[PDB]
Design a protein around this ligand. Structure first.
Ligand code: 7YS
Length: 270
Protein backbone atom coordinates (compact mmCIF):
# COMPACT_ATOMS: atom_id res chain seq x y z
CA UNK A 1 0.00 0.00 0.00
CA UNK A 2 2.72 2.52 1.14
CA UNK A 3 6.10 1.02 -0.10
CA UNK A 4 4.77 0.09 -3.61
CA UNK A 5 6.97 3.05 -4.76
CA UNK A 6 10.09 1.53 -3.06
CA UNK A 7 9.45 -1.62 -5.16
CA UNK A 8 9.91 0.49 -8.39
CA UNK A 9 12.75 2.79 -7.39
CA UNK A 10 14.98 -0.02 -6.05
CA UNK A 11 17.54 -1.75 -8.29
CA UNK A 12 19.21 -5.12 -7.56
CA UNK A 13 23.03 -4.70 -7.20
CA UNK A 14 23.43 -8.26 -8.78
CA UNK A 15 21.80 -6.98 -12.06
CA UNK A 16 24.29 -4.04 -12.35
CA UNK A 17 27.69 -4.62 -14.05
CA UNK A 18 30.36 -1.86 -13.82
CA UNK A 19 32.67 -1.05 -16.74
CA UNK A 20 35.00 1.90 -17.53
CA UNK A 21 35.05 5.03 -15.30
CA UNK A 22 33.48 8.16 -16.90
CA UNK A 23 34.82 10.62 -14.30
CA UNK A 24 35.74 11.46 -10.68
CA UNK A 25 34.35 13.96 -8.19
CA UNK A 26 34.34 15.13 -4.56
CA UNK A 27 30.84 13.61 -4.07
CA UNK A 28 31.56 10.26 -5.79
CA UNK A 29 32.61 8.25 -8.88
CA UNK A 30 30.68 7.58 -12.14
CA UNK A 31 31.05 4.44 -14.37
CA UNK A 32 29.71 3.10 -17.70
CA UNK A 33 27.39 0.22 -16.82
CA UNK A 34 25.15 -2.67 -17.89
CA UNK A 35 21.73 -3.19 -16.25
CA UNK A 36 20.03 -6.60 -16.53
CA UNK A 37 16.50 -5.33 -17.17
CA UNK A 38 15.13 -8.97 -17.16
CA UNK A 39 15.19 -10.25 -20.84
CA UNK A 40 17.03 -7.10 -21.96
CA UNK A 41 20.36 -5.41 -21.08
CA UNK A 42 20.52 -1.68 -20.76
CA UNK A 43 23.55 0.64 -21.15
CA UNK A 44 23.48 2.91 -18.08
CA UNK A 45 25.50 5.55 -16.07
CA UNK A 46 26.20 4.45 -12.46
CA UNK A 47 26.86 7.20 -9.88
CA UNK A 48 27.97 5.90 -6.47
CA UNK A 49 28.06 8.66 -3.89
CA UNK A 50 31.38 8.77 -1.87
CA UNK A 51 29.35 10.32 1.01
CA UNK A 52 27.61 7.46 2.88
CA UNK A 53 24.29 7.68 4.84
CA UNK A 54 24.79 8.14 8.60
CA UNK A 55 21.14 8.47 9.90
CA UNK A 56 17.68 6.87 9.25
CA UNK A 57 16.33 10.37 8.30
CA UNK A 58 19.17 10.72 5.71
CA UNK A 59 18.23 7.30 4.24
CA UNK A 60 14.52 8.33 4.44
CA UNK A 61 15.14 11.65 2.56
CA UNK A 62 17.28 10.02 -0.20
CA UNK A 63 14.63 7.38 -0.95
CA UNK A 64 11.80 10.06 -0.96
CA UNK A 65 13.77 12.30 -3.46
CA UNK A 66 14.60 9.21 -5.58
CA UNK A 67 10.82 8.41 -5.94
CA UNK A 68 10.28 12.13 -6.89
CA UNK A 69 13.02 11.95 -9.55
CA UNK A 70 11.73 8.65 -11.02
CA UNK A 71 8.35 10.43 -11.43
CA UNK A 72 10.05 12.87 -13.93
CA UNK A 73 8.74 12.28 -17.47
CA UNK A 74 9.80 15.02 -19.93
CA UNK A 75 12.20 14.97 -22.96
CA UNK A 76 14.26 17.81 -21.38
CA UNK A 77 14.55 16.21 -17.87
CA UNK A 78 16.82 13.23 -16.93
CA UNK A 79 14.81 10.12 -16.18
CA UNK A 80 16.23 8.37 -13.09
CA UNK A 81 16.27 4.56 -13.74
CA UNK A 82 16.69 3.52 -10.10
CA UNK A 83 18.68 3.35 -6.84
CA UNK A 84 21.11 0.86 -5.18
CA UNK A 85 23.41 0.83 -2.08
CA UNK A 86 27.11 -0.28 -2.15
CA UNK A 87 25.64 2.35 3.47
CA UNK A 88 26.73 4.38 0.39
CA UNK A 89 23.88 5.31 -2.02
CA UNK A 90 24.08 4.49 -5.76
CA UNK A 91 22.06 6.20 -8.57
CA UNK A 92 21.27 4.52 -11.96
CA UNK A 93 20.74 6.87 -14.93
CA UNK A 94 20.32 6.41 -18.74
CA UNK A 95 23.58 6.41 -20.71
CA UNK A 96 23.96 9.80 -22.50
CA UNK A 97 26.76 9.19 -25.05
CA UNK A 98 27.22 12.93 -25.90
CA UNK A 99 28.16 13.71 -22.23
CA UNK A 100 27.56 16.96 -20.32
CA UNK A 101 26.74 20.32 -21.95
CA UNK A 102 29.68 22.26 -20.34
CA UNK A 103 32.33 19.78 -21.63
CA UNK A 104 30.79 19.96 -25.15
CA UNK A 105 30.80 23.83 -25.21
CA UNK A 106 34.35 23.87 -23.70
CA UNK A 107 35.80 21.31 -26.19
CA UNK A 108 34.17 23.24 -29.13
CA UNK A 109 36.88 25.97 -28.78
CA UNK A 110 39.59 24.53 -26.54
CA UNK A 111 39.74 21.13 -28.24
CA UNK A 112 42.00 19.58 -30.94
CA UNK A 113 38.90 19.72 -33.28
CA UNK A 114 37.51 23.32 -32.78
CA UNK A 115 34.06 23.83 -34.39
CA UNK A 116 32.18 27.18 -34.05
CA UNK A 117 28.61 26.54 -32.71
CA UNK A 118 25.94 28.72 -34.45
CA UNK A 119 23.84 31.14 -32.34
CA UNK A 120 20.69 29.10 -33.19
CA UNK A 121 22.19 25.87 -31.74
CA UNK A 122 23.14 27.79 -28.55
CA UNK A 123 19.64 29.42 -28.25
CA UNK A 124 18.08 25.90 -28.75
CA UNK A 125 20.28 24.53 -25.87
CA UNK A 126 18.93 27.42 -23.66
CA UNK A 127 15.34 26.68 -24.83
CA UNK A 128 15.84 22.99 -23.92
CA UNK A 129 16.89 23.87 -20.28
CA UNK A 130 13.95 26.35 -19.84
CA UNK A 131 11.49 23.65 -21.10
CA UNK A 132 12.80 21.11 -18.56
CA UNK A 133 12.81 23.78 -15.84
CA UNK A 134 9.23 24.85 -16.71
CA UNK A 135 8.24 21.16 -16.24
CA UNK A 136 10.05 20.86 -12.83
CA UNK A 137 8.53 24.26 -11.73
CA UNK A 138 4.93 23.02 -12.46
CA UNK A 139 5.71 19.76 -10.56
CA UNK A 140 6.70 22.09 -7.62
CA UNK A 141 10.40 20.99 -7.73
CA UNK A 142 13.44 23.14 -6.84
CA UNK A 143 16.66 22.07 -8.66
CA UNK A 144 19.10 24.04 -6.37
CA UNK A 145 22.15 23.11 -8.60
CA UNK A 146 21.27 24.34 -12.12
CA UNK A 147 24.40 24.69 -14.35
CA UNK A 148 25.65 23.71 -17.86
CA UNK A 149 27.83 21.05 -16.10
CA UNK A 150 24.59 19.40 -14.72
CA UNK A 151 22.91 19.40 -18.13
CA UNK A 152 23.13 16.29 -20.34
CA UNK A 153 23.06 15.86 -24.15
CA UNK A 154 20.49 13.31 -25.53
CA UNK A 155 21.26 11.31 -28.77
CA UNK A 156 19.27 13.99 -30.79
CA UNK A 157 21.79 16.62 -29.34
CA UNK A 158 18.83 17.80 -27.25
CA UNK A 159 19.63 19.10 -23.75
CA UNK A 160 18.04 17.73 -20.60
CA UNK A 161 18.37 19.02 -17.04
CA UNK A 162 20.05 16.50 -14.62
CA UNK A 163 21.57 16.09 -11.07
CA UNK A 164 18.61 17.97 -9.40
CA UNK A 165 20.85 19.04 -6.48
CA UNK A 166 20.66 15.50 -4.94
CA UNK A 167 24.21 16.03 -3.51
CA UNK A 168 22.68 18.65 -1.08
CA UNK A 169 28.67 25.99 -6.75
CA UNK A 170 28.30 29.53 -5.23
CA UNK A 171 28.67 31.30 -8.71
CA UNK A 172 25.23 29.94 -9.84
CA UNK A 173 23.35 30.47 -6.52
CA UNK A 174 20.90 33.45 -6.32
CA UNK A 175 21.89 36.44 -4.17
CA UNK A 176 19.00 35.74 -1.65
CA UNK A 177 20.08 32.03 -1.43
CA UNK A 178 23.70 33.01 -0.59
CA UNK A 179 22.34 35.43 2.08
CA UNK A 180 19.44 33.50 3.67
CA UNK A 181 19.91 29.86 2.45
CA UNK A 182 16.32 30.16 1.09
CA UNK A 183 15.63 28.37 -2.26
CA UNK A 184 12.64 28.97 -4.60
CA UNK A 185 11.86 28.54 -8.33
CA UNK A 186 12.95 32.24 -8.59
CA UNK A 187 16.44 31.28 -7.38
CA UNK A 188 16.43 28.53 -10.08
CA UNK A 189 15.70 31.35 -12.61
CA UNK A 190 18.89 33.16 -11.38
CA UNK A 191 20.96 29.94 -11.93
CA UNK A 192 19.40 29.63 -15.40
CA UNK A 193 20.50 33.21 -16.27
CA UNK A 194 24.07 32.15 -15.29
CA UNK A 195 23.65 28.99 -17.49
CA UNK A 196 22.48 31.06 -20.50
CA UNK A 197 25.68 33.18 -20.07
CA UNK A 198 27.70 29.87 -19.76
CA UNK A 199 26.19 28.76 -23.11
CA UNK A 200 26.61 32.25 -24.78
CA UNK A 201 30.31 32.41 -23.70
CA UNK A 202 30.74 28.68 -24.74
CA UNK A 203 31.82 27.43 -21.31
CA UNK A 204 33.54 30.41 -19.73
CA UNK A 205 33.85 30.61 -15.94
CA UNK A 206 31.30 33.00 -14.38
CA UNK A 207 32.97 36.03 -12.67
CA UNK A 208 36.67 35.54 -13.72
CA UNK A 209 39.11 36.57 -10.98
CA UNK A 210 36.36 36.68 -8.33
CA UNK A 211 36.74 34.05 -5.57
CA UNK A 212 33.65 32.22 -4.16
CA UNK A 213 34.18 33.94 -0.78
CA UNK A 214 34.10 37.38 -2.55
CA UNK A 215 30.99 36.51 -4.69
CA UNK A 216 28.28 37.61 -2.19
CA UNK A 217 29.89 41.07 -1.79
CA UNK A 218 30.64 41.36 -5.53
CA UNK A 219 26.91 40.72 -6.34
CA UNK A 220 25.81 42.86 -3.31
CA UNK A 221 27.87 45.81 -4.69
CA UNK A 222 25.63 45.67 -7.83
CA UNK A 223 27.99 43.66 -10.05
CA UNK A 224 26.58 41.12 -12.55
CA UNK A 225 28.04 38.95 -15.34
CA UNK A 226 29.29 41.31 -18.14
CA UNK A 227 27.73 41.02 -21.64
CA UNK A 228 29.81 38.92 -24.10
CA UNK A 229 30.94 40.87 -27.20
CA UNK A 230 29.54 38.11 -29.50
CA UNK A 231 26.18 37.95 -27.59
CA UNK A 232 22.91 39.63 -28.71
CA UNK A 233 21.41 42.51 -26.67
CA UNK A 234 18.06 40.64 -26.49
CA UNK A 235 19.60 37.37 -25.22
CA UNK A 236 21.61 39.40 -22.63
CA UNK A 237 18.37 41.22 -21.62
CA UNK A 238 16.79 37.78 -20.85
CA UNK A 239 19.90 36.88 -18.71
CA UNK A 240 19.82 40.21 -16.80
CA UNK A 241 16.11 39.74 -15.96
CA UNK A 242 16.99 36.42 -14.20
CA UNK A 243 19.52 38.35 -11.99
CA UNK A 244 17.07 41.03 -10.81
CA UNK A 245 17.58 41.78 -7.03
CA UNK A 246 13.83 41.34 -6.33
CA UNK A 247 12.92 37.68 -7.13
CA UNK A 248 9.38 38.77 -8.15
CA UNK A 249 10.91 40.99 -10.95
CA UNK A 250 12.55 37.85 -12.51
CA UNK A 251 10.63 36.06 -15.35
CA UNK A 252 9.01 32.63 -14.99
CA UNK A 253 10.39 29.50 -16.74
CA UNK A 254 7.25 29.54 -18.95
CA UNK A 255 8.01 33.22 -19.86
CA UNK A 256 11.70 32.40 -20.65
CA UNK A 257 10.73 29.35 -22.81
CA UNK A 258 8.44 31.60 -24.92
CA UNK A 259 11.02 34.43 -25.46
CA UNK A 260 13.71 31.85 -26.28
CA UNK A 261 11.38 29.99 -28.73
CA UNK A 262 10.34 33.32 -30.36
CA UNK A 263 13.98 34.31 -31.03
CA UNK A 264 14.69 30.70 -32.21
CA UNK A 265 12.10 30.74 -35.07
CA UNK A 266 13.54 34.11 -36.28
CA UNK A 267 17.06 32.55 -36.50
CA UNK A 268 18.26 30.16 -39.34
CA UNK A 269 17.62 26.37 -38.87
CA UNK A 270 18.20 23.63 -37.52
C1 7YS B 1 29.23 9.46 -21.33
C2 7YS B 1 29.61 10.49 -20.31
N1 7YS B 1 30.76 11.13 -20.43
N2 7YS B 1 30.80 12.03 -19.38
C3 7YS B 1 31.95 12.93 -19.28
C4 7YS B 1 31.92 14.03 -20.32
O1 7YS B 1 30.74 14.79 -20.25
C5 7YS B 1 29.70 11.96 -18.59
C6 7YS B 1 28.89 10.97 -19.13
C7 7YS B 1 27.57 10.48 -18.63
C8 7YS B 1 26.63 9.87 -19.47
N3 7YS B 1 25.38 9.61 -19.08
C9 7YS B 1 24.99 9.93 -17.82
N4 7YS B 1 23.72 9.73 -17.49
C10 7YS B 1 25.99 10.50 -16.95
N5 7YS B 1 27.23 10.75 -17.36
O2 7YS B 1 25.62 10.80 -15.69
C11 7YS B 1 26.52 11.37 -14.74
C12 7YS B 1 26.07 10.95 -13.36
C13 7YS B 1 26.63 12.91 -14.92
C14 7YS B 1 27.88 13.52 -15.05
C15 7YS B 1 27.99 14.90 -15.21
C16 7YS B 1 26.86 15.70 -15.28
C17 7YS B 1 25.63 15.10 -15.16
F1 7YS B 1 24.52 15.87 -15.27
C18 7YS B 1 25.52 13.76 -14.97
CL1 7YS B 1 23.92 13.14 -14.78
C19 7YS B 1 29.15 12.71 -14.95
O3 7YS B 1 29.53 12.37 -13.85
N6 7YS B 1 29.83 12.42 -16.08
C20 7YS B 1 31.06 11.64 -15.98
C21 7YS B 1 29.44 12.87 -17.41
Amino acid sequence: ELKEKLRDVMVDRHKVALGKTLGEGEFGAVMEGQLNQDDSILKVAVKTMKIAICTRSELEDFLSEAVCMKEFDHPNVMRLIGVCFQPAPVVILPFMKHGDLHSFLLYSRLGDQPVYLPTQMLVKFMADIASGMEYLSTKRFIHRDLAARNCMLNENMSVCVADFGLSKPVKWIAIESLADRVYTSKSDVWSFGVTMWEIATRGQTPYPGVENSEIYDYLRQGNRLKQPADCLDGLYALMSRCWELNPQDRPSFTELREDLENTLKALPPA
